[PDB]
Amino acid sequence: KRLTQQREYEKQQKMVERIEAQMNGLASWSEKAHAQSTKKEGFKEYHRVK
């Protein structure tokens, strides 16, 4: 039972670190995609919607 609970805790801790990493990558893209708008090509809301 200690092996079962240790495997399931290792799985949810690994999954938590994975989703926090893939959430941080999207944040570091949303900061760029908000700051690098308003420069050229399309007004400023076609790029703010992204």
Reduced to 3 states (helix: H, G, I; strand: E, B; else coil), residue 7 is helix
Count of residues of this chain found to bind RNA when the rule CB under 7 A is applied: 14
| Contact pattern from residue 1 through residue 40 relative to RNA, giving x for each residue in contact according to CB under 7 A and a dash for the rest | ---------------------x--xx--x--xx--x----
Structure tokens at 5: 């609970």
Contact 25, 8 (CB under 8 A): no
* Residue (9 or 46) nearer to RNA, CB: 46
C-beta atoms surrounding 50 within 10 Å: 10
Residue numbers at the binding site for RNA (CB under 7 A): 22, 25-26, 29, 32-33, 36, 41-43, 45-47, 50
